């Protein structure tokens, strides 16, 4: 979908980021990088929340390279770790970076706030 003749270019505006949530606390970047078996990326691409006690709010933001990962990475939307449903949904970088730094305000994946 052209979606509007633009003009390609350096990746502007790329779908490179994933974010994963509705995940139990209790697991640790580690297990993560084992529900994502099969796709080659980094440790360092995936950023693990913690909170004041470290456990975390359930949620992680992973960063590939090209959509070549991502598009896989989304494949596994809607699956069952540990027994839990995860919801993998697909951003822009700008959009990961800015969550990293500041975590959803409301939050709807998931009972965050009740």
Same mark, same amino acid.
């Given at each position: 979908g052209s979606s509007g003749s633009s003009g390609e270019g350096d990746?502007?505006?790329?779908?490179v980021c994933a974010h994963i949530t509705? *995940?139990?606390?209790? *697991?640790?970047k580690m297990d993560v990088l084992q529900f994502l078996e099969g796709i080659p990326v980094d440790e360092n691409a995936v950023h693990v929340l913690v909170d004041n006690n470290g456990q975390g709010l359930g949620q992680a933001l992973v960063q590939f390279k090209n959509e070549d990962d991502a598009r896989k990475s989304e494949r596994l939307h809607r699956k069952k770790l540990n027994g839990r449903e995860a919801f993998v949904h697909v951003v822009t970088l700008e959009d990961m970076r800015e969550i990293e730094k500041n975590p959803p305000a409301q939050g709807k994946s998931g009972p965050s706030s009740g």
């Amino acid at each position: 979908g052209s979606s509007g003749s633009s003009g390609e270019g350096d990746v502007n505006s790329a779908k490179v980021c994933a974010h994963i949530t509705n *995940i139990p606390f209790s *697991i640790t970047k580690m297990d993560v990088l084992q529900f994502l078996e099969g796709i080659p990326v980094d440790e360092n691409a995936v950023h693990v929340l913690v909170d004041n006690n470290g456990q975390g709010l359930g949620q992680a933001l992973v960063q590939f390279k090209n959509e070549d990962d991502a598009r896989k990475s989304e494949r596994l939307h809607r699956k069952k770790l540990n027994g839990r449903e995860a919801f993998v949904h697909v951003v822009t970088l700008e959009d990961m970076r800015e969550i990293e730094k500041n975590p959803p305000a409301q939050g709807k994946s998931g009972p965050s706030s009740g």
